[PDB]
């Protein structure tokens, strides 16, 4: 196998032209093809297309209205430009090598990937745009272990990163903030809870405080009960 | 064309042996032998295992078996080690000169004993829906192994739409947590009796459910 070297600008806005480039280290084109492969947060691994050093191309069907593929043998480097973007089209995409062979007359072997670049992470969104914050007031779902699960729903900001503290950060005890998840709109949203005792809500205060530092928001969001 | 179907989620503790299927059709796994198999770390780039069904690339570990049988190829890893819980994607050439793939299997190794998820749904609160908007939250903790699928209900009909779910990662005890999104308009939460997340877990199903009228 070789190793594949890629670059080109992840940061994108819709409409816009990913252009992404991948450089061969040692191996060349030879007989082979050189492919773009997608990894979207959600789904599993999109077959983008592929080329040979001649220029022969064979494209994703879902794709190939907005994709073309390029190679540059004096600087043995091949290409991906796929126009038109959306947030559909945020992904890690890696460049790798399809080492096809012919046997004989019918017989294809080396019909797999190999030669796997390490990524360029994609996103697509319009603009910087901070996050409404929501309470998730306590429900009591551990009756056994008498405890209750309260919380912020941080919805729809971008780009990453937004840190959750707990009553300006002196509650850190039993609080978990997930992982964001992207959603088809390109925005993010999060959820940060906190695990506390039943008899403990109403008399101690929840206060969570949300600070999406990309865009200078800061709030904090009162957490109380719905119901005694 | 259309992606191998795979199971989302195979568990073996070490020493096991397990095996990932990979469907497909006619045009792909059925009449060729051009299926592969492909392990990632998470960061880490794709690394291939199986090539051609069942050739192994030197460096590859022989508890690493490829094979086929009609419509359905299989990956079978012996000697289950903890460096094998990754995802694994299979993928094959086809009869109309494309590749496609999997949608991918997350293998655990059981480190530790399983750990059945709590699973607390929050309602749209007031204040979103004030706002013209409804996202309901499913919580999941304190599970083990860290694999978990999520299926929401309209009443008792399937909801795809709108639906968003992370990865599991450890919480600060050191089991799993998850998160499942449905975001719903005012209306679509106020026209149904009620919605419930189902959270699936190492062969059994746990149950949440909330209603507009509550």
């Known amino acids: 196998q070789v190793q594949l070297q890629q670059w080109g600008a992840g940061l994108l806005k819709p409409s816009e032209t990913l252009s992404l480039t991948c450089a061969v280290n040692g191996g060349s084109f030879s007989i082979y093809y050189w492919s773009w492969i997608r990894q979207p947060p959600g789904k599993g691994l999109d077959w983008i297309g592929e080329i040979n050093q001649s220029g022969s191309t064979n494209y994703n069907p879902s794709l190939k209205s907005r994709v073309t593929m390029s190679v540059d043998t004096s600087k043995s480097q091949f290409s991906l430009r796929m126009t038109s973007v959306t947030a559909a089209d945020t992904a890690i995409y890696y460049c790798?090598?399809?080492?096809?062979?012919?046997?004989?007359?019918?017989?294809?072997?080396?019909?797999?990937?190999?030669?796997w670049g390490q990524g360029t992470l994609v996103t697509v969104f319009n603009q910087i745009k901070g996050p409404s914050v929501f309470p998730l007031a306590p429900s009591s779902k551990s009756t056994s272990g008498g405890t209750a699960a309260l919380g912020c729903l941080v919805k729809d900001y971008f780009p990453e990163p937004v840190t959750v503290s707990w009553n300006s950060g002196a509650l850190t005890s039993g609080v978990h903030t997930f992982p964001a998840v992207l959603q088809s709109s390109g925005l993010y949203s999060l959820s940060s809870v906190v695990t506390v005792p039943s008899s403990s809500l109403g008399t101690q205060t929840y206060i969570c405080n949300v600070n999406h530092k990309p865009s200078n928001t800061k709030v904090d969001k009162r957490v109380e009960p719905k119901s005694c | 064309q259309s992606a191998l179907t795979q199971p989302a989620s195979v568990s073996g503790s070490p020493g096991q042996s397990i095996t990932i299927s990979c469907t497909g059709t006619s045009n792909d796994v059925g009449d060729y032998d051009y299926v592969s198999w492909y392990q990632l770390h998470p960061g880490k780039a794709p690394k291939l295992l199986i090539f051609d069904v069942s050739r192994r690339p030197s460096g590859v570990s022989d508890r690493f078996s490829g094979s086929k049988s009609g419509d359905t190829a299989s990956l079978t890893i012996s000697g289950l080690q903890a460096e094998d819980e990754a995802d694994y994607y299979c993928s094959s050439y086809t009869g109309s000169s494309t590749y496609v793939f999997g949608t991918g299997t997350k293998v655990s190794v059981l480190s530790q004993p399983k750990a059945n998820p709590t699973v607390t749904l929050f309602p749209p609160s007031s204040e979103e829906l004030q706002a013209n908007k409804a996202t309901l939250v499913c919580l999941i903790s304190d599970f083990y192994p860290g694999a978990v699928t999520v299926a929401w209900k309209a009443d008792s009909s399937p909801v795809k739409a709108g639906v968003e779910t992370t990865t599991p990662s450890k919480q600060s005890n050191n089991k799993y947590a998850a998160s499942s999104y449905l975001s719903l308009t005012p209306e679509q939460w106020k026209s149904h009796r009620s919605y419930s997340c189902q959270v699936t877990h190492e062969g059994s199903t746990v149950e949440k459910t909330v209603a507009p009228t509550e």
């Open positions: 790798a090598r399809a080492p096809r062979i012919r046997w004989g007359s019918y017989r294809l072997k080396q019909t797999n990937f190999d030669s």
